[PDB]
Design a protein around this nucleic acid. Structure first.
Lengths: 74, 74
DNA sequence: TTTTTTTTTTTTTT
C-alpha cells in the first residue's frame, strides 16, 4: 500500500534462497511499524531493493505449527 | 479473483485453530486448479463457507524450512 | 518475473 512501510528486524529465523525472479524467501521476526514484534514469512527482491507480500505467523500459529512440523520430520 | 477457484485436497498437513474472526488457520497440500499439487498455508471462514489468501510453499521452501524449523525446536 | 501489513481477506494450473 504505502511506498515504505515502517518495520524493524527483531530476530532472523530462517533463510531459504532466491528464486527465478530473485525472490529472497525468508522467515524473520519483525516489528509491525516498529510496534508489535511477530513472525512473518515473505520474499523480497534479489538486490534487496524492495519487498513483497506474504503471510504473518502469530505465536499461537508458529507454536503449534513448529511442534507438529518438527515432529513430522521425526 | 474468481468466485470459486478450482482445487483439490491432496494431503492435510497441519491444522492450527480459528481466530477472533473465525479464520481457520491450516496448512494443507492441494492441487492448484486440480493440476499441480503443492503446499499452501491459508485461513478460511469459521463455517468453511469461503476461503482467503495466504502463501504457497514449494518443495524447495518447505524442505529447507522444515529442516531448520524442526532443528530450531531441538 | 508481488513491490511488505502497529493481530473482522473472500484462495492462486510456480
Amino acid at each position: 500500500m504505502a511506498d515504505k512501510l515502517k518495520f524493524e528486524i527483531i530476530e532472523e529465523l530462517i533463510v531459504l534462497s532466491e528464486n527465478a525472479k530473485g525472490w529472497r524467501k525468508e522467515l524473520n521476526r519483525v516489528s509491525w511499524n516498529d510496534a508489535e514484534p511477530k513472525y512473518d514469512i515473505r520474499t523480497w527482491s534479489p538486490d534487496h531493493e524492495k519487498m513483497g507480500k506474504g503471510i504473518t505467523l502469530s505465536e499461537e500459529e508458529f507454536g503449534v505449527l513448529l511442534k507438529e512440523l518438527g515432529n513430522k520430520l521425526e
